[PDB]
Design a protein around this ligand. Structure first.
Ligand SMILES: [Cl-]
Ligand SMILES: [Cl-]
Ligand SMILES: [K+]
Length: 164
C-alpha cells in the first residue's frame, strides 16, 4: 500500500470524461477538469492538460501521467500551506498518505474547514480526531470513502484498504 495505490482505489480509472461525486467533469484517476457545467469547457481543459486535441478520450498512460502530476502537486501544496504543513510534518507516513488523499479530494480550500480535526491529529488524539472528522459535509456526502480515510488516521494502518 502507498498513496498512489490508495488514491487509485478511491478514485478508480476512467479514460473518457465522466462526472465525479459532485457532478463535475473529470477523467483518469480522479483528475478534476472543471466545475463548469459545460462539457465543451471540460474538453478544453483536458486538451490543455494532455497537450493534444483529445475529444474527451485519453490513454491509460496519459491518465497515469496526470495522476502523477496531481499527487505530486498535492503533496507540494500541502508543504506550502502554512495551515497544513505542520500537520503533515507531525505525522507518520501512513497517516501522511491519508492527509494527501483528503486534500486530493477536497482541495486545500476544502481543508480550511478541518482546522479542528487537523489539530486533533497534530495532538495525536486519534480517536477524537476520528470522531471530529465525521462531523462534516465531506463525511456525509462520501461516507464510505471518508470512513476509510478516518480509520487510517485513527489507526495508522492500511487495514481499511486491504481486500480492495
Ligand atoms: Cl493539469
Ligand atoms: Cl463514498
Ligand atoms: K472518481
Amino acid at each position: 500500500m502507498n498513496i498512489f495505490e490508495m488514491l487509485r482505489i478511491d478514485e478508480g480509472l476512467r479514460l473518457k470524461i465522466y462526472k465525479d461525486t459532485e457532478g463535475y467533469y473529470t477523467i483518469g484517476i480522479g483528475h478534476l477538469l472543471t466545475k463548469s457545467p459545460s462539457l465543451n469547457a471540460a474538453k478544453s481543459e483536458l486538451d490543455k492538460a494532455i497537450g493534444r486535441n483529445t475529444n474527451g478520450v485519453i490513454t491509460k498512460d496519459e491518465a497515469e501521467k496526470l495522476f502523477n502530476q496531481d499527487v505530486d502537486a498535492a503533496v507540494r501544496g500541502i508543504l506550502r500551506n502554512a495551515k497544513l504543513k505542520p500537520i503533515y510534518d507531525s505525522l507518520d507516513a501512513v497517516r501522511r498518505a491519508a492527509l494527501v488523499n483528503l486534500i486530493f479530494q477536497i482541495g486545500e480550500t476544502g481543508a480550511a474547514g478541518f482546522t479542528n480535526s487537523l489539530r486533533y491529529l497534530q495532538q495525536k488524539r486519534w480517536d477524537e480526531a476520528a470522531v471530529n472528522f465525521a462531523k462534516s459535509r465531506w463525511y456525509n456526502q462520501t461516507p464510505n470513502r471518508a470512513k476509510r480515510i478516518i480509520t487510517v488516521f485513527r489507526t495508522g494502518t492500511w487495514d481499511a484498504y486491504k481486500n480492495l
